[PDB]
Enzyme design. Structure first.
Site, PDB file in Angstrom:
ATOM      1  N   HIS A  44       0.824  -1.213   0.000  1.00  0.00           N
ATOM      2  CA  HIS A  44       0.000   0.000   0.000  1.00  0.00           C
ATOM      3  C   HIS A  44       0.857   1.261   0.000  1.00  0.00           C
ATOM      4  CE1 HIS A  44       0.102   0.534   4.608  1.00  0.00           C
ATOM      5  NE2 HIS A  44      -0.036   1.773   4.159  1.00  0.00           N
ATOM      6  N   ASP A  93      -0.555  -7.369   1.829  1.00  0.00           N
ATOM      7  CA  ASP A  93       0.041  -6.050   1.787  1.00  0.00           C
ATOM      8  C   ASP A  93       1.537  -6.212   1.878  1.00  0.00           C
ATOM      9  OD1 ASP A  93       0.334  -3.377   1.877  1.00  0.00           O
ATOM     10  OD2 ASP A  93      -0.361  -3.108   3.957  1.00  0.00           O
ATOM     11  N   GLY A 186       3.412   6.208   8.593  1.00  0.00           N
ATOM     12  CA  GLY A 186       4.816   6.485   8.271  1.00  0.00           C
ATOM     13  C   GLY A 186       5.771   5.345   8.628  1.00  0.00           C
ATOM     14  N   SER A 188       4.596   2.250   8.131  1.00  0.00           N
ATOM     15  CA  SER A 188       4.159   1.301   7.128  1.00  0.00           C
ATOM     16  C   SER A 188       5.299   0.769   6.288  1.00  0.00           C
ATOM     17  CB  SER A 188       3.146   1.938   6.173  1.00  0.00           C
ATOM     18  OG  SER A 188       1.981   2.321   6.899  1.00  0.00           O
ATOM     19  N   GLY A 189       5.296  -0.550   6.077  1.00  0.00           N
ATOM     20  CA  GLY A 189       6.304  -1.160   5.236  1.00  0.00           C
ATOM     21  C   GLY A 189       7.537  -1.576   6.003  1.00  0.00           C
TER      22      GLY A 189
END
Length: 238
Positions: A44, A93, A186, A188-189
């Site tokens: 995402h 994701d 922020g 994320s990932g």
């Protein structure tokens, strides 16, 4: 990272910052260096951004305001988003990024060991989430890499906290009953690493949460063991 503390050099050497350079250049997501030319992140992070040429990846950094036009960065040679990932939905994701040139390892820039698909039954016990995202819900991107100790929660318990959603077996949840400690926008990932038998392993990829750090709202992460066949087929095929 809501309720974390500043990290040190060499502490999380696999942490990377994925930044977009549009009118300004801004940190959007974390990532985890998994080999000289591969970074793992959340699919995402790329929603609505249709070109790889806008991305800059930064590794071996602690402080985002140290980044200037002098800081070395990696460029994207390709992004492999999982087939079944659907934009704005939370399943699968996960995306791999192949970098344009291999990175050398230093004490400040090194890969994280991946679990095996079979480690999906393992219950880890000392887990840490890190990144430069918001320190509070509706907050701002931090400059110093934050780190926080979070306990994993069972998928059944996490399912009771997110009845509106379907938390599957390819997801892992972590949080406190009282809230207070969580990843946030922020982050994320980025990595959720757990130290198992004296070795750090990538257990999750930061994915989503109902707000951030709320009471009885554990953060939800992509479970990397359930994607180990996909990671090995896509990095090997390339």
């Amino acid at each position: 990272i809501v309720g974390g503390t500043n990290s040190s050099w060499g502490e999380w050497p696999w942490q990377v910052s994925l930044q977009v350079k549009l009118t300004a250049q801004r940190h959007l997501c974390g990532g985890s260096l998994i080999g000289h030319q591969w970074v793992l992140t959340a699919a995402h992070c790329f929603d609505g951004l249709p070109l790889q040429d806008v991305w800059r990846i930064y590794s071996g950094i602690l402080n985002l305001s140290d980044i200037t036009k002098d800081t070395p960065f990696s460029q994207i040679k390709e992004i492999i988003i999982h087939q079944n990932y659907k934009v704005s939905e939370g399943n699968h994701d996960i995306a791999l990024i192949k970098l344009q040139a291999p990175l050398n390892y230093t004490e400040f820039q090194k890969p994280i060991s991946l679990p095996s698909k079979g480690d999906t039954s393992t219950i880890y016990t000392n887990c840490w989430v890190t990144g430069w995202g918001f320190s509070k819900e509706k907050g701002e991107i931090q400059n110093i890499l934050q780190k926080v100790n979070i306990p994993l929660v069972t998928n059944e318990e996490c399912q009771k906290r997110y009845q509106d959603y379907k938390i599957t077996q390819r997801m892992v949840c972590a949080g406190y009953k009282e809230g207070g400690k969580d990843a946030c926008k922020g982050d994320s990932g980025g990595p959720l690493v757990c130290k198992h038998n004296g070795m750090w392993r990538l257990v999750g990829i930061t994915s989503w949460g109902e707000g951030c750090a709320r009471r009885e709202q554990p953060g939800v992460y992509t479970k990397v063991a359930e994607y180990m066949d996909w990671i090995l087929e896509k990095t090997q095929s390339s």
